[PDB]
């Protein structure tokens, strides 16, 4: 079983993650993310856009069971994060969530 918070942080530290709806959609759109993570309270249209662009490319989407406040904190930020994209997992097992 995958340790979300550990592996998310491990991927943030040893790989490449981009944060926020805009960059998530962008990396989804262009085929450059290997995984998209979305907080439970992402704006419904932003969540549906991600889902859409993700399904176009066959990129898995993971629904973080938690708010954008919790997700932002997990990524070490003092502000909300409604979505993020794992471009490079580094040494982490985060892509196993897919």
Numbering used by the authors: 0 to 97
What does the paper say about this structure?
For example, we have shown that the thermophilic ribosomal protein L30e from Thermococcus celer has a ΔCp value of ∼5 kJ mol−1 K−1, which is much smaller than the value of ∼10 kJ mol−1 K−1 obtained for the mesophilic L30e from yeast. To study the contribution of charge-charge interactions to the thermostability and the reduced ΔCp of thermophilic proteins, our group had systematically removed 26 surface charges on T. celer L30e by single charge-to-alanine substitutions. Since thermophilic proteins tend to have more salt-bridges than their mesophilic homologs, our observation that salt-bridge reduces ΔCp may provide a general mechanism for enhancing thermostability - thermophilic proteins have more stabilizing salt-bridges that reduce the ΔCp, leading to the up-shifting and broadening of the protein stability curve.
We have selected two salt-bridges (E6/R92 and K46/E62), which are located on opposite sides of T. celer L30e. The crystal structures of the E6A/R92A, K46A/E62A, and E90A/R92A variants were determined at resolution ranging from 1.8 to 2.0 Å. The root-mean-square deviations (r.m.s.d.) between Cα atoms of the wild-type L30e and its variants were <0.5 Å, suggesting there were no major structural change in these variants. The values of ΔΔGint were in the range of 1.9–3.6 kJ mol−1 for the pairs of charged residues (E6/R92 and E62/K46) involved in salt-bridges. The average values of ΔΔGint for the salt-bridges E6/R92 and E62/K46 were 2.3±0.3 and 3.9±0.3, respectively, while the value for the control pair was 0.6±0.3 kJ mol−1. Compared to the wild-type value of 5.3 kJ mol−1 K−1, ΔCp were increased to 5.7–6.8 kJ mol−1 K−1 for substitutions (E6A, E62A, K46A/M, R92A/M) that break a salt-bridge interaction. In contrast, for the cycles, E6A/R92A(M) and E62A/K46A(M), that involves breakage of a salt-bridge, values of ΔΔCp(int) were from −0.8 to −1.0 kJ mol−1 K−1. For the double-mutant cycles that break a salt-bridge (i.e. E6/R92 and E62/K46), negative values of ΔΔCp(int) suggest that the pair-wise interaction of the salt-bridges reduces the ΔCp by 0.8 to 1.0 kJ mol−1 K−1.
